[PDB]
Tab-separated table of N, CA, C and O in Angstrom:
chain	number	residue	atom	x	y	z
N	541	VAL	N	93.562	77.457	100.786
N	541	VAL	CA	95.015	77.442	100.918
N	541	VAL	C	95.664	77.001	99.613
N	541	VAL	O	96.684	77.557	99.190
N	542	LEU	N	95.080	76.000	98.950
N	542	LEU	CA	95.633	75.526	97.686
N	542	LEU	C	95.638	76.628	96.637
N	542	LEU	O	96.603	76.768	95.876
N	543	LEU	N	94.565	77.417	96.576
N	543	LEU	CA	94.494	78.497	95.599
N	543	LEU	C	95.567	79.548	95.859
N	543	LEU	O	96.158	80.084	94.915
N	544	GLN	N	95.831	79.854	97.130
N	544	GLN	CA	96.863	80.829	97.466
N	544	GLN	C	98.236	80.433	96.949
N	544	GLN	O	99.016	81.310	96.566
N	545	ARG	N	98.552	79.141	96.921
N	545	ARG	CA	99.906	78.709	96.612
N	545	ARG	C	100.146	78.517	95.117
N	545	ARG	O	101.304	78.415	94.700
N	546	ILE	N	99.100	78.507	94.295
N	546	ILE	CA	99.275	78.330	92.859
N	546	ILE	C	98.742	79.495	92.037
N	546	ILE	O	99.151	79.646	90.874
N	547	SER	N	97.851	80.323	92.569
N	547	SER	CA	97.311	81.409	91.769
N	547	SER	C	98.330	82.537	91.622
N	547	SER	O	99.063	82.848	92.562
N	548	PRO	N	98.393	83.163	90.448
N	548	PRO	CA	99.287	84.309	90.249
N	548	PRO	C	98.682	85.658	90.598
N	548	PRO	O	99.386	86.669	90.505
N	549	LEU	N	97.414	85.705	90.994
N	549	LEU	CA	96.748	86.960	91.310
N	549	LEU	C	97.178	87.442	92.687
N	549	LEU	O	97.185	86.670	93.650
N	550	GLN	N	97.529	88.720	92.775
N	550	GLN	CA	97.957	89.341	94.019
N	550	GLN	C	97.059	90.529	94.320
N	550	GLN	O	96.785	91.349	93.439
N	551	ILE	N	96.605	90.621	95.563
N	551	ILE	CA	95.667	91.654	95.983
N	551	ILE	C	96.456	92.745	96.693
N	551	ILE	O	96.954	92.543	97.805
N	552	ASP	N	96.574	93.901	96.049
N	552	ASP	CA	97.270	95.046	96.623
N	552	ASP	C	96.273	96.175	96.829
N	552	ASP	O	95.931	96.875	95.863
N	553	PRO	N	95.789	96.403	98.054
N	553	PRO	CA	94.724	97.396	98.253
N	553	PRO	C	95.185	98.838	98.131
N	553	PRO	O	94.340	99.740	98.201
N	554	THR	N	96.483	99.093	97.954
N	554	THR	CA	96.946	100.467	97.801
N	554	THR	C	96.498	101.083	96.484
N	554	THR	O	96.614	102.301	96.311
N	555	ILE	N	95.997	100.272	95.550
N	555	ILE	CA	95.497	100.804	94.286
N	555	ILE	C	94.320	101.738	94.532
N	555	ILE	O	94.201	102.797	93.906
N	556	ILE	N	93.435	101.357	95.454
N	556	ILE	CA	92.248	102.161	95.734
N	556	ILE	C	92.645	103.515	96.307
N	556	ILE	O	92.114	104.558	95.907
N	557	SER	N	93.585	103.520	97.252
N	557	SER	CA	93.956	104.762	97.919
N	557	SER	C	94.650	105.726	96.965
N	557	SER	O	94.477	106.946	97.071
N	558	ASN	N	95.449	105.202	96.033
N	558	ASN	CA	96.164	106.069	95.103
N	558	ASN	C	95.198	106.849	94.218
N	558	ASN	O	95.370	108.055	94.007
N	559	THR	N	94.177	106.175	93.686
N	559	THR	CA	93.209	106.862	92.837
N	559	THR	C	92.414	107.893	93.626
N	559	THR	O	92.162	109.000	93.137
N	560	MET	N	92.013	107.550	94.851
N	560	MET	CA	91.213	108.461	95.659
N	560	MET	C	91.989	109.699	96.085
N	560	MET	O	91.373	110.706	96.444
N	561	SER	N	93.321	109.647	96.058
N	561	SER	CA	94.118	110.783	96.505
N	561	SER	C	94.071	111.954	95.534
N	561	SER	O	94.494	113.056	95.895
N	562	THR	N	93.573	111.745	94.315
N	562	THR	CA	93.558	112.783	93.292
N	562	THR	C	92.156	113.315	93.019
N	562	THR	O	91.938	113.982	92.003
N	563	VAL	N	91.198	113.030	93.900
N	563	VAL	CA	89.847	113.546	93.726
N	563	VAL	C	89.824	115.032	94.052
N	563	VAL	O	90.408	115.480	95.048
N	564	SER	N	89.152	115.809	93.207
N	564	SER	CA	89.058	117.250	93.387
N	564	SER	C	87.938	117.578	94.365
N	564	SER	O	86.780	117.219	94.134
N	565	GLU	N	88.286	118.266	95.449
N	565	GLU	CA	87.327	118.589	96.496
N	565	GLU	C	87.644	119.966	97.058
N	565	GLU	O	88.673	120.569	96.747
N	566	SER	N	86.736	120.457	97.893
N	566	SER	CA	86.922	121.694	98.636
N	566	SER	C	87.002	121.376	100.122
N	566	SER	O	86.270	120.517	100.622
N	567	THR	N	87.890	122.071	100.826
N	567	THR	CA	88.129	121.808	102.238
N	567	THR	C	87.137	122.516	103.149
N	567	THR	O	87.225	122.369	104.372
N	568	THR	N	86.201	123.278	102.589
N	568	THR	CA	85.179	123.959	103.370
N	568	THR	C	83.857	123.206	103.384
N	568	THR	O	82.856	123.744	103.864
N	569	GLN	N	83.830	121.981	102.872
N	569	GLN	CA	82.612	121.191	102.791
N	569	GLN	C	82.536	120.217	103.958
N	569	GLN	O	83.560	119.726	104.440
N	570	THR	N	81.311	119.943	104.408
N	570	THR	CA	81.124	119.085	105.572
N	570	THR	C	81.358	117.617	105.232
N	570	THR	O	81.899	116.865	106.050
N	571	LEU	N	80.963	117.191	104.036
N	571	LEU	CA	81.042	115.795	103.635
N	571	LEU	C	82.105	115.610	102.560
N	571	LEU	O	82.247	116.447	101.664
N	572	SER	N	82.846	114.509	102.654
N	572	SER	CA	83.888	114.177	101.690
N	572	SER	C	83.605	112.808	101.089
N	572	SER	O	83.687	111.796	101.804
N	573	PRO	N	83.261	112.720	99.801
N	573	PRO	CA	83.032	111.393	99.203
N	573	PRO	C	84.252	110.491	99.244
N	573	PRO	O	84.116	109.274	99.419
N	574	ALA	N	85.450	111.054	99.086
N	574	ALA	CA	86.655	110.233	99.021
N	574	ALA	C	86.987	109.627	100.379
N	574	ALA	O	87.401	108.467	100.469
N	575	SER	N	86.828	110.405	101.450
N	575	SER	CA	87.155	109.897	102.778
N	575	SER	C	86.158	108.836	103.226
N	575	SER	O	86.539	107.845	103.858
N	576	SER	N	84.875	109.031	102.915
N	576	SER	CA	83.846	108.120	103.404
N	576	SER	C	84.011	106.723	102.818
N	576	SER	O	83.887	105.722	103.530
N	577	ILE	N	84.290	106.637	101.516
N	577	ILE	CA	84.391	105.330	100.868
N	577	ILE	C	85.586	104.556	101.411
N	577	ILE	O	85.518	103.339	101.615
N	578	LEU	N	86.697	105.251	101.662
N	578	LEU	CA	87.866	104.584	102.223
N	578	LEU	C	87.588	104.086	103.634
N	578	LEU	O	88.112	103.046	104.048
N	579	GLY	N	86.772	104.820	104.390
N	579	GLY	CA	86.406	104.364	105.719
N	579	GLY	C	85.577	103.095	105.692
N	579	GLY	O	85.754	102.209	106.531
N	580	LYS	N	84.657	102.993	104.732
N	580	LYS	CA	83.817	101.804	104.644
N	580	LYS	C	84.605	100.605	104.136
N	580	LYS	O	84.375	99.473	104.577
N	581	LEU	N	85.535	100.828	103.207
N	581	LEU	CA	86.287	99.712	102.641
N	581	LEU	C	87.297	99.162	103.638
N	581	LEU	O	87.414	97.943	103.797
N	582	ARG	N	88.022	100.045	104.324
N	582	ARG	CA	89.029	99.694	105.322
N	582	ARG	C	89.967	98.607	104.782
N	582	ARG	O	89.828	97.432	105.138
N	583	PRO	N	90.900	98.962	103.896
N	583	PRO	CA	91.807	97.955	103.323
N	583	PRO	C	92.590	97.183	104.373
N	583	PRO	O	93.350	97.769	105.151
N	584	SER	N	92.408	95.862	104.399
N	584	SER	CA	93.077	95.011	105.375
N	584	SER	C	93.829	93.881	104.684
N	584	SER	O	93.952	93.869	103.455
N	585	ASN	N	94.334	92.926	105.464
N	585	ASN	CA	95.155	91.851	104.921
N	585	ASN	C	94.363	90.561	104.760
N	585	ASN	O	94.671	89.743	103.887
N	586	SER	N	93.342	90.369	105.591
N	586	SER	CA	92.580	89.126	105.613
N	586	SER	C	91.516	89.054	104.524
N	586	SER	O	90.607	88.224	104.625
N	587	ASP	N	91.601	89.897	103.493
N	587	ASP	CA	90.626	89.837	102.409
N	587	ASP	C	90.776	88.559	101.594
N	587	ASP	O	89.887	88.203	100.811
N	588	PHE	N	91.904	87.863	101.754
N	588	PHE	CA	92.124	86.620	101.023
N	588	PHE	C	91.082	85.568	101.379
N	588	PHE	O	90.525	84.913	100.492
N	589	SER	N	90.803	85.397	102.673
N	589	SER	CA	90.009	84.266	103.136
N	589	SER	C	88.611	84.249	102.529
N	589	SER	O	88.188	83.248	101.944
Y	1158	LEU	N	101.461	150.986	102.952
Y	1158	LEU	CA	102.069	149.726	103.352
Y	1158	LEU	C	101.124	148.903	104.210
Y	1158	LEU	O	101.062	147.679	104.072
Y	1159	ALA	N	100.394	149.553	105.119
Y	1159	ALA	CA	99.428	148.824	105.932
Y	1159	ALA	C	98.366	148.175	105.054
Y	1159	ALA	O	98.019	146.999	105.237
Y	1160	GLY	N	97.855	148.927	104.078
Y	1160	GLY	CA	96.858	148.377	103.175
Y	1160	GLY	C	97.394	147.219	102.357
Y	1160	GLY	O	96.697	146.228	102.129
Y	1161	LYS	N	98.639	147.334	101.892
Y	1161	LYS	CA	99.246	146.227	101.159
Y	1161	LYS	C	99.412	145.001	102.050
Y	1161	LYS	O	99.141	143.873	101.623
Y	1162	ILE	N	99.845	145.206	103.295
Y	1162	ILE	CA	100.117	144.090	104.197
Y	1162	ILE	C	98.833	143.358	104.561
Y	1162	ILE	O	98.828	142.129	104.700
Y	1163	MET	N	97.725	144.088	104.708
Y	1163	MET	CA	96.483	143.471	105.172
Y	1163	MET	C	96.046	142.280	104.327
Y	1163	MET	O	95.407	141.357	104.843
Y	1164	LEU	N	96.381	142.275	103.037
Y	1164	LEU	CA	95.955	141.200	102.147
Y	1164	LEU	C	97.126	140.600	101.379
Y	1164	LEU	O	96.939	139.693	100.565
Y	1165	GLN	N	98.337	141.090	101.623
Y	1165	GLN	CA	99.501	140.587	100.913
Y	1165	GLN	C	99.962	139.264	101.527
Y	1165	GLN	O	99.787	139.005	102.720
Y	1166	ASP	N	100.555	138.416	100.688
Y	1166	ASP	CA	100.934	137.056	101.063
Y	1166	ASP	C	102.452	136.978	101.178
Y	1166	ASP	O	103.169	137.302	100.226
Y	1167	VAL	N	102.936	136.542	102.340
Y	1167	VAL	CA	104.366	136.401	102.578
Y	1167	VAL	C	104.729	134.922	102.617
Y	1167	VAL	O	103.867	134.041	102.624
Y	1168	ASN	N	106.031	134.648	102.648
Y	1168	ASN	CA	106.521	133.280	102.616
Y	1168	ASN	C	106.499	132.648	104.009
Y	1168	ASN	O	106.207	133.297	105.019
Y	1169	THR	N	106.824	131.353	104.044
Y	1169	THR	CA	106.739	130.588	105.285
Y	1169	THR	C	107.720	131.103	106.330
Y	1169	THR	O	107.397	131.154	107.522
Y	1170	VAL	N	108.931	131.470	105.906
Y	1170	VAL	CA	109.925	131.970	106.851
Y	1170	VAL	C	109.431	133.249	107.512
Y	1170	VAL	O	109.576	133.435	108.726
Y	1171	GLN	N	108.840	134.147	106.726
Y	1171	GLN	CA	108.333	135.397	107.279
Y	1171	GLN	C	107.122	135.152	108.175
Y	1171	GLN	O	106.956	135.817	109.203
Y	1172	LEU	N	106.262	134.196	107.805
Y	1172	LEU	CA	105.139	133.846	108.672
Y	1172	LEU	C	105.608	133.294	110.011
Y	1172	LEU	O	105.044	133.630	111.058
Y	1173	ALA	N	106.639	132.450	110.001
Y	1173	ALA	CA	107.001	131.702	111.201
Y	1173	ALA	C	107.531	132.590	112.319
Y	1173	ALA	O	107.683	132.115	113.449
Y	1174	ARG	N	107.817	133.864	112.041
Y	1174	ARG	CA	108.363	134.731	113.079
Y	1174	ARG	C	107.309	135.129	114.106
Y	1174	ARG	O	107.650	135.683	115.156
Y	1175	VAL	N	106.031	134.861	113.827
Y	1175	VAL	CA	104.986	135.181	114.797
Y	1175	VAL	C	105.132	134.315	116.042
Y	1175	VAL	O	104.853	134.760	117.162
Y	1176	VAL	N	105.568	133.072	115.869
Y	1176	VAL	CA	105.738	132.146	116.977
Y	1176	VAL	C	107.214	131.970	117.335
Y	1176	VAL	O	107.590	130.955	117.919
Y	1177	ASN	N	108.054	132.946	116.988
Y	1177	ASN	CA	109.479	132.926	117.316
Y	1177	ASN	C	110.165	131.682	116.757
Y	1177	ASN	O	110.966	131.034	117.433
Y	1178	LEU	N	109.847	131.343	115.512
Y	1178	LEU	CA	110.436	130.200	114.831
Y	1178	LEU	C	111.452	130.679	113.806
Y	1178	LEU	O	111.155	131.546	112.979
Y	1179	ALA	N	112.655	130.110	113.864
Y	1179	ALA	CA	113.734	130.486	112.965
Y	1179	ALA	C	114.443	129.233	112.475
Y	1179	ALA	O	114.447	128.194	113.139
Y	1180	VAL	N	115.045	129.346	111.295
Y	1180	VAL	CA	115.768	128.240	110.675
Y	1180	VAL	C	117.028	127.949	111.483
Y	1180	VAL	O	117.784	128.878	111.801
Y	1181	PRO	N	117.286	126.694	111.842
Y	1181	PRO	CA	118.520	126.369	112.565
Y	1181	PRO	C	119.752	126.746	111.758
Y	1181	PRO	O	119.766	126.652	110.528
Y	1182	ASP	N	120.798	127.180	112.464
Y	1182	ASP	CA	122.011	127.624	111.788
Y	1182	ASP	C	122.714	126.468	111.090
Y	1182	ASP	O	123.471	126.678	110.135
Y	1183	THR	N	122.481	125.238	111.551
Y	1183	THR	CA	123.101	124.082	110.916
Y	1183	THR	C	122.516	123.792	109.541
Y	1183	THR	O	123.135	123.065	108.758
Y	1184	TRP	N	121.345	124.342	109.227
Y	1184	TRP	CA	120.701	124.124	107.940
Y	1184	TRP	C	121.136	125.127	106.882
Y	1184	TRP	O	120.719	125.005	105.726
Y	1185	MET	N	121.959	126.110	107.249
Y	1185	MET	CA	122.276	127.202	106.338
Y	1185	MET	C	123.106	126.751	105.144
Y	1185	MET	O	123.178	127.474	104.146
Y	1186	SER	N	123.740	125.583	105.222
Y	1186	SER	CA	124.540	125.056	104.126
Y	1186	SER	C	123.755	124.107	103.229
Y	1186	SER	O	124.337	123.509	102.319
Y	1187	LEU	N	122.454	123.955	103.463
Y	1187	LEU	CA	121.629	123.024	102.712
Y	1187	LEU	C	120.480	123.772	102.052
Y	1187	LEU	O	120.148	124.900	102.425
Y	1188	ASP	N	119.874	123.124	101.057
Y	1188	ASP	CA	118.768	123.710	100.300
Y	1188	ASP	C	117.456	123.336	100.983
Y	1188	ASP	O	116.783	122.361	100.636
Y	1189	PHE	N	117.083	124.144	101.979
Y	1189	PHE	CA	115.852	123.882	102.716
Y	1189	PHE	C	114.632	124.436	101.992
Y	1189	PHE	O	113.498	124.089	102.341
Y	1190	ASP	N	114.838	125.299	100.994
Y	1190	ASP	CA	113.713	125.879	100.267
Y	1190	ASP	C	112.928	124.809	99.521
Y	1190	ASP	O	111.691	124.793	99.545
Y	1191	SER	N	113.636	123.904	98.845
Y	1191	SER	CA	112.968	122.828	98.124
Y	1191	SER	C	112.223	121.912	99.085
Y	1191	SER	O	111.108	121.464	98.798
Y	1192	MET	N	112.831	121.621	100.237
Y	1192	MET	CA	112.175	120.787	101.236
Y	1192	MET	C	110.897	121.442	101.744
Y	1192	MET	O	109.864	120.782	101.900
Y	1193	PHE	N	110.947	122.750	102.004
Y	1193	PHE	CA	109.752	123.486	102.395
Y	1193	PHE	C	108.676	123.489	101.321
Y	1193	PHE	O	107.499	123.319	101.651
Y	1194	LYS	N	109.044	123.674	100.057
Y	1194	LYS	CA	108.069	123.881	98.994
Y	1194	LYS	C	107.475	122.601	98.432
Y	1194	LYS	O	106.258	122.526	98.252
Y	1195	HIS	N	108.289	121.585	98.152
Y	1195	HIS	CA	107.839	120.453	97.356
Y	1195	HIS	C	107.916	119.110	98.067
Y	1195	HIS	O	107.549	118.095	97.466
Y	1196	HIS	N	108.376	119.060	99.317
Y	1196	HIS	CA	108.607	117.784	99.974
Y	1196	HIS	C	107.907	117.623	101.314
Y	1196	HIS	O	107.947	116.525	101.877
Y	1197	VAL	N	107.276	118.665	101.839
Y	1197	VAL	CA	106.446	118.563	103.032
Y	1197	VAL	C	105.000	118.731	102.589
Y	1197	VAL	O	104.559	119.847	102.296
Y	1198	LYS	N	104.253	117.632	102.533
Y	1198	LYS	CA	102.885	117.654	102.038
Y	1198	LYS	C	101.926	117.872	103.199
Y	1198	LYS	O	101.978	117.150	104.199
Y	1199	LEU	N	101.063	118.878	103.067
Y	1199	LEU	CA	100.061	119.189	104.074
Y	1199	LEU	C	98.729	118.510	103.788
Y	1199	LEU	O	97.693	118.940	104.306
Y	1200	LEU	N	98.739	117.462	102.969
Y	1200	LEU	CA	97.549	116.695	102.652
Y	1200	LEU	C	97.861	115.222	102.890
Y	1200	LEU	O	98.923	114.739	102.462
Y	1201	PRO	N	96.986	114.484	103.569
Y	1201	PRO	CA	97.237	113.055	103.784
Y	1201	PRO	C	97.385	112.320	102.459
Y	1201	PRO	O	96.712	112.634	101.476
Y	1202	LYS	N	98.289	111.338	102.438
Y	1202	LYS	CA	98.585	110.633	101.193
Y	1202	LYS	C	97.358	109.903	100.664
Y	1202	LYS	O	97.094	109.907	99.457
Y	1203	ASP	N	96.599	109.260	101.553
Y	1203	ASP	CA	95.413	108.531	101.117
Y	1203	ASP	C	94.366	109.478	100.540
Y	1203	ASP	O	93.710	109.161	99.542
Y	1204	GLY	N	94.198	110.646	101.152
Y	1204	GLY	CA	93.238	111.612	100.657
Y	1204	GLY	C	92.976	112.764	101.605
Y	1204	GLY	O	93.912	113.372	102.131
Y	1205	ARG	N	91.703	113.072	101.825
Y	1205	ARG	CA	91.285	114.173	102.683
Y	1205	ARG	C	90.752	113.622	103.996
Y	1205	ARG	O	89.878	112.749	103.998
Y	1206	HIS	N	91.280	114.127	105.106
Y	1206	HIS	CA	90.846	113.734	106.438
Y	1206	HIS	C	90.075	114.877	107.082
Y	1206	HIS	O	90.385	116.051	106.857
Y	1207	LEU	N	89.065	114.525	107.878
Y	1207	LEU	CA	88.213	115.539	108.492
Y	1207	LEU	C	89.004	116.420	109.453
Y	1207	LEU	O	88.810	117.640	109.496
Y	1208	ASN	N	89.904	115.818	110.233
Y	1208	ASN	CA	90.670	116.589	111.208
Y	1208	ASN	C	91.670	117.510	110.522
Y	1208	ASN	O	91.836	118.670	110.916
Y	1209	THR	N	92.346	117.011	109.487
Y	1209	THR	CA	93.368	117.784	108.781
Y	1209	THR	C	92.694	118.741	107.797
Y	1209	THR	O	92.720	118.567	106.577
Y	1210	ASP	N	92.078	119.779	108.359
Y	1210	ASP	CA	91.404	120.807	107.574
Y	1210	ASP	C	91.762	122.167	108.150
Y	1210	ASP	O	91.476	122.441	109.319
Y	1211	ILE	N	92.383	123.009	107.335
Y	1211	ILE	CA	92.836	124.330	107.762
Y	1211	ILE	C	91.722	125.331	107.473
Y	1211	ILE	O	91.302	125.448	106.311
Y	1212	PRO	N	91.217	126.048	108.472
Y	1212	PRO	CA	90.202	127.076	108.218
Y	1212	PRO	C	90.743	128.156	107.300
Y	1212	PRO	O	91.941	128.471	107.337
């Protein structure tokens, strides 16, 4: 809690999604590298703890 | 003409007549072309989704 109130670092998980939105892919493929990684990461709010 | 049509590409307004879809008359005073072309994204913002795939 002390670190949260004095540290200037801010965690914004939208950075990951923005970069992944520009990956070049084909829509006729069964597997998508960009979708799978976002599913495993699952950007949430409780990453602070 | 049949041969041209078989592989020729038409616009969204011409396509939409298959399902009896027409532009509302209240929109005739506005620029709906730009909204159709550059402001309705058919790709999820985060990326590519398995369900949102057009054959």
